[PDB]
């Protein structure tokens, strides 16, 4: 086991990730960030030094598990104080199984201003994965938005709400293009790219060598969009989900949601004097966005060798049953960690958007997450019991709410409570939609937890009741740490509270995030340690740790 | 029988139609045009002076038949020069007939410039209409983009093509709103307009009494869009269609293509305490651009008082067999002439989409519509034989002709040559539509005789063969002077080569207009009188009729 150390700054710059210049926050001068990779049971140190001028900022290790650092999280006012402006702070934290993940930003909305970047994990030295390959292609998708962040959020906070509204732009390793089409030879009506390849904004191309096979790892850190990754004749093998290998199937395409990462294997049988088409399209929201184009380039053909059909036609984005019959058909592989069989907590979480005092905001429970100045770990650790609400959030919703209809917003409430764990319980959640402000209106929501992976028991239609307890999967469920709620549905996960800390689960399209939609949960916090001064000095933490008597 | 006398000019002006300054070419100082009204029988007499500075002008007067006037028609280089910057021409011509029409540009994209207006023919003085009603609504329809004109015209003029994409706004009256939504408060995505109700962009609002029945005249002058009239909580009884009267019927909502007009009456029955929604939106196109929208305001109701439910949702655009549905209902009210049953000519036109050198081009049996210099009417009245080809235009196409796949592109050109008709031929045009260039695409494309009404006799999916006959409505076809194809099929239409002149058959749409997709029909020439001497100023007419010898 190695120790693989990091010595980052975070600082913006101008950029043009689609060609048309802004800024983005980039690691020592790069967007995307660098790529960590590690082999399982490495330990990882990143010093970060924050180079921004007035902004605080954390980084996010997107599925690590931070089992005895909880510290190192990177999640602002839960695990940490956010770094201030020319500090450096150490994440320190052991990888201890192999996967596809990332990092992005947890502060604000700096993860869609470009704070993110890979996360691999390979085998332990000497071991190997179940399958074979010959080579690797690593895909980071995200989507791009041409207005400043800071005009988002301000615009997700004032009344009437200003959405951001649909990406201009995705972006496939950073690279996307913006109001020409690198295909506009299939049809007159897309302007032609004018581009050599040398520009920030020119397709990153996958490079193949006839009758191979490849590995290709995709993970998704949009903001907002919900993709569906398609190759030109060629079919999928999906072999890894969530570091954690499924059971192997075919598709001719995969949906993937923000928080999700996936390996996929392909293998180049097809015509060698041809190149193909790898698309990247809008699903489960109406779309108003052009895909995400690039090659996949059998080598020695040109690269300027367009293929002879037109890239992959996207899905249609509202066949939620085409969306539902990829999804089921995920299990764990044979021989995987089955579930415990008998629960101890069973917690319903309603999802809904309401108005509250003029503004719109999203609520579980009927209460929308305001996070605290004074970070919920340390808060916990020290018992300051005033940084916080300490009555108990509530683990149900009304058996007579109608979940078809708009909310009333009668009760709707801010709050900032936590649900408390006991180290060992087995807890399930049962995650309901319901239709949202505007009738006749449910969206999909990807919600991932921090800090544990828990096997995906089922998923349902309208509301979830007792008749469904039998249909739940106890033999195979799949191991993820995001999940996918389908319009006007439910899904259960189970998983043990066994990791020591703070940990939120919450929707990954960030301006849910921003408008509430998460919960936090904590457990064994008596078992944490000792907590890096710079996590704890903020808030209340920094008023009681820090001794400056007064008369004394 | 009176004169009704026009003093007008037209001159470019600063106008912001959805709010968005731009320039717009007003009548008069004002956008849309003035609205002209005669009763059956009347003379109108327009003097019109072009206070325009570089350009030429002409106006067109849709559906007037210019029985005995063909050099009135108001189309450049076929029945007339263009009147030049500084000058005034006289149009002179008589309504025959009572119903709803229009005026607009017809020399370039001129039209799509905000050259527009309503010409309303009501029934002989004393004669009363077949229907009651006790009051009138009149809505013209057109479709608005922020780039220039002149910008647009050079883009579809140039290798590669620059396509002008979907409108901006739809224009309910010359009003339209861009950015916000007046129906904002059903949908927290939208962004409220911020309107006092006296800008230039704020809703022409329908003003109604209950209990009372209104004639709402619809025509529509746009460049590209196929739209769709609804009216929240009423039903609509088609009554008018094209200045002639249809077999009356129900409908929810209806389809209006470029180049149409109808009339249909409602009754306010429905609760006086509210108001109602009227939607203007875009079918068969992929919509990109929010719908015209207004109110029924049921006085004396405020008319900030808006609806308790959302617009009526437009139907989907490609929903085809619906269009074809309402399409296909339309037919004579009894009492209206029959066709010829037996016909003496049978044309049949390919529509296609073409690449001719590098351009994309439309073309009609391989034929792409290229405007001689020289005005045909001049050119033929004085038997100028050099002035355009005098061979016979195709009036067939190969029988071999796969409409499902893209053109070949082999044998296509550019021409000007004219189908010429014997004065009194029964005439018979069956319009082939055809795959475009892009794999499986085809689309409606709205075709419309100048100088004559025609009977529909029928409209068939894929290619007409001989065996469709017994298909074709020979007792109760409508007359209309406007038609649509729908993709990959055929319209059949008739009607008798009975007017003196030259006149032009083509699509509505103006961009496929300026890309070639039309014919030009002559018939009984040495029947026509003198014409203007202004509209013979020009090409080989002015080069052969002005007396200017040389050594002299
Ligand atoms: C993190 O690792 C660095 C380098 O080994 C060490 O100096 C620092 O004290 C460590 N801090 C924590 C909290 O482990
Ligand atoms: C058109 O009518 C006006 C008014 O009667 C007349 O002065 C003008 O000469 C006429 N011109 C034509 C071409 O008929
Ligand atoms: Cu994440
Ligand atoms: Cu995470
Ligand atoms: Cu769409
Ligand atoms: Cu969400
Ligand atoms: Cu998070
Ligand atoms: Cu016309
Ligand atoms: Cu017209
Ligand atoms: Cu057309
Ligand atoms: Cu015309
Ligand atoms: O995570
Ligand atoms: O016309």
Same mark, same amino acid.
């Given at each position: 086991?190695?120790?693989?150390?990091?010595?980052?700054?975070?600082?913006?710059?101008?950029?043009?990730?689609?060609?048309?210049?802004?800024?983005?926050?980039?690691?020592?001068?790069?967007?995307?960030?660098?790529?960590?990779?590690?082999?399982?049971?490495?330990?990882?140190?990143?010093?970060?030094? /924050? !180079?921004?001028?007035?902004?605080?900022?954390?980084?996010?290790?997107?599925?690590?598990?931070?089992?005895?650092?909880?510290?190192?999280?990177?999640?602002?006012?839960?695990?940490?104080?956010?770094? /201030?402006?020319?500090?450096?702070?150490?994440?320190?934290?052991?990888?201890?199984?192999?996967?596809?993940?990332?990092?992005?930003?947890?502060?604000?909305?700096?993860?869609?201003?470009?704070?993110?970047?890979?996360?691999?994990?390979?085998?332990?030295?000497?071991?190997?994965?179940?399958?074979?390959?010959?080579?690797?292609?690593?895909?980071?998708?995200?989507?791009?938005?041409?207005?400043?962040?800071?005009?988002?959020?301000?615009?997700?906070?004032?009344?009437?709400?200003?959405?951001?509204?649909?990406?201009?732009?995705?972006?496939?390793?950073?690279?996307?293009?913006?109001?020409?089409?690198?295909?506009?030879?299939?049809?007159?009506?897309?302007?032609? &790219?004018?581009?050599?390849?040398?520009?920030?904004?020119?397709?990153?191309?996958?490079?193949?060598?006839?009758?191979?096979?490849?590995?290709?790892?995709?993970?998704?850190?949009?903001?907002?969009?919900?993709?569906?990754?398609?190759?030109?004749?060629?079919?999928?093998?999906?072999?890894?989900?969530?570091?954690?290998?499924?059971?192997?199937?075919?598709?001719?395409?995969?949906?993937?949601?923000?928080?999700?990462?996936?390996?996929?294997?392909?293998?180049?049988?097809?015509?060698?004097?041809?190149?193909?088409?790898?698309?990247?399209?809008?699903?489960?929201?109406?779309?108003?966005?052009?895909?995400?184009?690039?090659?996949?380039?059998?080598?020695?053909?040109?690269?300027?060798?367009?293929?002879?059909?037109?890239?992959?036609?996207?899905?249609?984005?509202?066949?939620?049953?085409?969306?539902?019959?990829?999804?089921?058909?995920?299990?764990?592989?044979?021989?995987?960690?089955?579930?415990?069989?008998?629960?101890?907590?069973?917690?319903?979480?309603? +999802?809904?958007? +309401?108005?509250?005092?003029?503004?719109?905001?999203?609520?579980?429970?009927?209460?929308?997450?305001?996070?605290?100045?004074?970070?919920?770990?340390?808060?916990?650790?020290? /018992?300051?019991?005033?940084?916080?609400?300490?009555?108990?959030?509530?683990?149900?919703?009304?058996?007579?709410?109608?979940?078809?209809?708009?909310?009333?917003?009668?009760?709707?409430?801010?709050?900032?409570?936590?649900?408390?764990?006991?180290?060992?319980?087995?807890?399930?959640?049962?995650?309901?939609?319901? /239709?949202?402000?505007?009738?006749?209106?449910?969206?999909?929501?990807?919600?991932?937890?921090?800090?544990?992976?828990?096997?995906?028991?089922?998923?349902?239609?309208?509301?979830?009741?007792?008749?469904?307890?039998?249909?739940?999967?106890?033999?195979?469920?799949?191991?993820?740490?995001?999940?996918?709620?389908?319009?006007?549905?439910?899904?259960?996960?189970?998983?043990?509270?066994?990791?020591?800390?703070?940990?939120?689960?919450? &929707?990954?399209?960030?301006?849910?995030?921003?408008?509430?939609?998460?919960?936090?949960?904590?457990?064994?916090?008596? !078992?944490?340690?000792?907590?890096?001064?710079?996590?704890?000095?903020?808030?209340?933490?920094?008023?009681?740790?820090?001794?400056?008597?007064?008369?004394?």
């Amino acid at each position: 086991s190695q120790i693989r150390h990091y010595k980052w700054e975070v600082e913006y710059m101008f950029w043009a990730p689609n060609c048309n210049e802004n800024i983005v926050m980039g690691i020592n001068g790069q967007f995307p960030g660098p790529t960590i990779r590690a082999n399982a049971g490495d330990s990882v140190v990143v010093e970060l030094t /924050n !180079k921004l001028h007035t902004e605080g900022v954390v980084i996010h290790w997107h599925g690590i598990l931070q089992r005895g650092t909880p510290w190192a999280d990177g999640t602002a006012s839960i695990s940490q104080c956010a770094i /201030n402006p020319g500090e450096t702070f150490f994440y320190n934290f052991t990888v201890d199984n192999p996967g596809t993940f990332f990092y992005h930003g947890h502060l604000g909305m700096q993860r869609s201003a470009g704070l993110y970047g890979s996360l691999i994990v390979d085998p332990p030295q000497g071991k190997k994965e179940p399958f074979h390959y010959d080579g690797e292609i690593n895909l980071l998708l995200s989507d791009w938005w041409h207005q400043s962040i800071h005009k988002q959020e301000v615009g997700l906070s004032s009344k009437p709400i200003r959405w951001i509204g649909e990406p201009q732009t995705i972006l496939l390793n950073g690279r996307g293009q913006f109001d020409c089409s690198i295909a506009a030879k299939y049809d007159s009506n897309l302007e032609p &790219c004018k581009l050599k390849g040398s520009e920030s904004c020119a397709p990153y191309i996958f490079h193949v060598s006839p009758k191979k096979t490849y590995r290709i790892r995709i993970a998704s850190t949009t903001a907002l969009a919900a993709l569906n990754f398609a190759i030109g004749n060629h079919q999928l093998l999906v072999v890894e989900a969530d570091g954690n290998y499924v059971q192997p199937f075919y598709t001719s395409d995969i949906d993937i949601y923000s928080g999700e990462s996936y390996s996929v294997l392909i293998t180049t049988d097809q015509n060698p004097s041809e190149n193909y088409w790898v698309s990247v399209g809008t699903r489960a929201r109406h779309p108003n966005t052009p895909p995400g184009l690039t090659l996949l380039n059998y080598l020695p053909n040109s690269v300027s060798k367009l293929p002879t059909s037109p890239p992959p036609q996207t899905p249609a984005w509202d066949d939620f049953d085409r969306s539902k019959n990829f999804t089921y058909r995920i299990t764990a592989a044979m021989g995987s960690p089955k579930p415990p069989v008998k629960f101890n907590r069973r917690i319903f979480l309603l +999802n809904t958007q +309401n108005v509250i005092n003029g503004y719109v905001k999203w609520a579980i429970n009927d209460v929308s997450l305001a996070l605290p100045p004074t970070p919920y770990l340390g808060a916990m650790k020290y /018992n300051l019991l005033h940084a916080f609400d300490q009555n108990p959030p509530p683990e149900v919703f009304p058996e007579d709410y109608d979940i078809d209809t708009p909310p009333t917003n009668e009760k709707t409430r801010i709050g900032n409570g936590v649900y408390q764990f006991k180290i060992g319980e087995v807890v399930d959640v049962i995650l309901q939609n319901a /239709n949202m402000m505007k009738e006749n209106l449910s969206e999909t929501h990807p919600w991932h937890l921090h800090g544990h992976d828990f096997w995906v028991l089922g998923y349902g239609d309208g509301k979830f009741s007792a008749e469904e307890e039998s249909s739940l999967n106890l033999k195979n469920p799949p191991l993820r740490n995001t999940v996918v709620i389908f319009p006007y549905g439910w899904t259960a996960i189970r998983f043990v509270a066994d990791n020591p800390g703070v940990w939120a689960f919450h &929707c990954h399209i960030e301006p849910h995030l921003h408008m509430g939609m998460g919960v936090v949960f904590a457990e064994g916090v008596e !078992k944490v340690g000792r907590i890096p001064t710079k996590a704890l000095a903020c808030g209340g933490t920094a008023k009681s740790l820090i001794n400056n008597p007064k008369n004394p």
